[PDB]
Amino acid sequence: FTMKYVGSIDQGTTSTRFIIFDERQRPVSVHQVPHTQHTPHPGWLEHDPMEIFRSACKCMSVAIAKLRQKDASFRKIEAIGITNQRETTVAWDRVTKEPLCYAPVWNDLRTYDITKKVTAELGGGDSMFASKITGLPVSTYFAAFKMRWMLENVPAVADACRRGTLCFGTIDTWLMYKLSGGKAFVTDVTNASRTFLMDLRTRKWSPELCEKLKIPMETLPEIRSNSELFGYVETDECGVAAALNERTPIMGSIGDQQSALFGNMCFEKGEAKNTYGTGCFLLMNVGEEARFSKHGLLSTVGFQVGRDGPCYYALEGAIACAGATVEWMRRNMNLFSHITECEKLARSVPGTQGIVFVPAFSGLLAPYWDPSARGTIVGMTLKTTRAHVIRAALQAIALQLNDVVGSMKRDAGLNLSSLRVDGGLSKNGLLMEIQASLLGVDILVPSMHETTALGAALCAGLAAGVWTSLEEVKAVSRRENSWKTVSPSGSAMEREAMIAEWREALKRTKWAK
Amino acid sequence: FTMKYVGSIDQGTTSTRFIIFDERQRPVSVHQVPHTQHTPHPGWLEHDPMEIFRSACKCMSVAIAKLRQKDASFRKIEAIGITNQRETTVAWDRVTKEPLCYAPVWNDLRTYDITKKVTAELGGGDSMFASKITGLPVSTYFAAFKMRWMLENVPAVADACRRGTLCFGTIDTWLMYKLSGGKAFVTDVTNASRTFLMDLRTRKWSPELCEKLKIPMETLPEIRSNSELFGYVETDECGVAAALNERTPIMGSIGDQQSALFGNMCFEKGEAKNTYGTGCFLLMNVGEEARFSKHGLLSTVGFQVGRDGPCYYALEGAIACAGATVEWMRRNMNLFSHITECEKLARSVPGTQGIVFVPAFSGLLAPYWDPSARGTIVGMTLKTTRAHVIRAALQAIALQLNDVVGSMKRDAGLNLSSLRVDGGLSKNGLLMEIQASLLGVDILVPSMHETTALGAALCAGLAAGVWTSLEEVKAVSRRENSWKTVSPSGSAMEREAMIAEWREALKRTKWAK
Ligand SMILES: Nc1ncnc2c1ncn2[C@@H]1O[C@H](COP(=O)(O)OP(=O)(O)O)[C@@H](O)[C@H]1O
């Protein structure tokens, strides 16, 4: 009997990937293609939508070709899931099927002025005014503000609106449009919760905000769950349709951070995950009911398996410099050269012995939202070494997540039961130990590291009946994909010293303007 | 007649040199011999005074013997000058002519408890209570608290005192006693100003202070100028009378920092010198009347040519971590490897792009005495690099000296005229330019950088008629020895911003206890 496979498009900030999974939840074929990171003005970032689409189809046709060399009795993929960098917004025309301009990216800062024009003229000052509707504060990140900026500052967008041709879309929507030939204009609830145009509880567009923010709802896609029929792959860009060999349904769509939650099996309330990439995104599943935030955290959709399946919600927090800190220490400061020296140097000392290092190189986020904070070290003596500084960096990442989790527990009214961790810094043993001690929960480290791409494939597979239930999903995961477990081992008194010391350091970090 | 030669004994903390200078102020023969650093308990440091005496003597014989080989016009040394690590205190017996113990060194900390007692019981809790007599605060450095400690803790010393055979003396006193056979029990004004027993205004021992501190005046040597006949070399230790050949008078004695003030030609009020060593010692000639400091700067005697000749007073400030910071950056943090790269990396960026590095590794000194301050860096971004950090360390050193100078100008009622520089860290071209720019004066860098030894040689040679006036000395320097002049090359707008950022940074440095 023949292996069924499920494809996952992982459309990230810096690259695109197609991972083909089998029924074991094993990546059996992968391919990656990068796209250009345009930076026209300092603080701006922008992607070519056609470069992304092409990257995605190039990825698919290559991975398929490789899989069929290792399984010549293959023939088709059961379904395809999409997961994506969120918030990043693309505008296109619906007759040409072509982008009107380059897509500003989640962390672009051009929408700043509009951030403020909005908060004042609509919010009556309160940045969290619309938050009980959307889940989100007003920031540069969210899609609506980028939709707005384009409408205001892009000739071809301004026009295309008046002509009744304008389509807006997060990357999922863009992928699904172009992948289906123009046939589907859709989004999923996770991506939709990032627009600042969607009512969290109801998971439908808010006409208040659309007409309030100057956004014609004719320019907005239909919302669905993460797990159902969205469309079929109709295009043929890089022989993609021919390589699929049968008409293939797109049955999965889910934002990248939620995809990692789902992919690490964080299905029940209290279960949470952290992705240590360049930064950190921590997400906690908080149950079937939406929770909102006294400490400036985000409230968002975790996932919804099926049209009127239950919708799980989550809280979300972030640190801006995690992996970037470690890389900064080698590339900027020459504190080590090979990647494994970081943990090696940090273990070589017993502690930080007085120093604290707050790696707030582009501000504190999270529950102490402070853009004036900069990178800071205190307590050095002539005994301090690069080893102490590196250890101190790792403690500091952990200490930020500690404060984030503290916040989520009070805003959610639950305990964190366990913490799943993925990303480059997932592989730093000492960091996961310090992390476990501070939170006082186990940190599970998946050795099938591809968990973001897995999330989308699970949504796709659940909808195509490759997996029948979440328990079948969890069970296959346990048979097939191992994990290291990192238990806490601190002591109430040490933790308190570390946090007290940390709390004093934070007061000395304010610096810019 | 023939070529004249003056010799200089430079008795430092870690070694002793003998430099022979010719009439052009050229060092023509040099030898160096170390002496043992005994540390009985942490924070304690002690020198073997007989080892010091022998080193000086070996230094002399070797330097002279080398010079006879390399210079057929060298007949004898016209006179010898002495310069010394100040404060270090020797106790010895006037009949055995030997020490009663090792000599606690200037940076020795065993006098800490005696220091707290003196403040509380003699000064009502004011450390500055005697500072209008001595120009000094109560501190572990000064000679009187070391005497006091030897009586209270050394049975032999207390014994010798009981028997009327006790001689206390700073290193100048000890060297002139031993070099003369035991016939001279003298000290120059500059070293005496470092005892906490001398009255700045009279340049005599202060009966009140000796009585209040219970150092019998009988134990102290006679106070003389820096330049006059102290006596004659008579010992034949290490063949030194053999090497000198003829009768050689000792005609110069002056404390090391002051010697550098003198050797740098700072003969007028408003002329200052800075030594850029492990730390920095900055002195300014304040003119013929003492100036007391409303900023914790120390008031001291600059110099005095001739028994009851005009006496030039000085203000003194220190920084603890100068070249030590350069060294920490290399040895502890791996920011560069060869010392040339320090200046190269700092040159490679136009400024510090807003970071400040306060290297208060061992507290803050200068006019912000704060032993709780620790090493700190603020303001970093992911654009910051080691080049920025190295350059900030250099800026930090110049900013401290800018604050010290500023304090001096307010205490003295005068402008800084120019700054002569020496020490290893004055080979750093960029540190010199930053310093000209911040201070708005020319920085003169002697090519003949042996300024400390030259002070003593000048005192001696003036007294011997090798040079007949301060103006002849200045001319000879100019005609014979290269001075490099470093003019300001900054803007007053940058200066201002650098200073404002320095001030903000200093507020963030408090950490210890
Ligand atoms: N236990 C299994 N049952 C069925 N097919 C398998 C099994 N293990 C591997 N495969 C198949 O072999 C091909 C390559 O898979 P891969 O995991 O790279 O194999 P390996 O485990 O030898 O590295 C895929 O088609 C995959 O589905």
Ligand SMILES: Nc1ncnc2c1ncn2[C@@H]1O[C@H](COP(=O)(O)OP(=O)(O)O)[C@@H](O)[C@H]1O
């Ligand atoms: N050529 C050079 N360039 C830059 N820095 C130097 C150079 N040579 C020595 N240094 C640094 O300057 C300091 C020189 O100190 P030094 O003058 O030797 O000690 P002291 O404090 O006893 O005068 C050292 O700490 C060293 O790091």
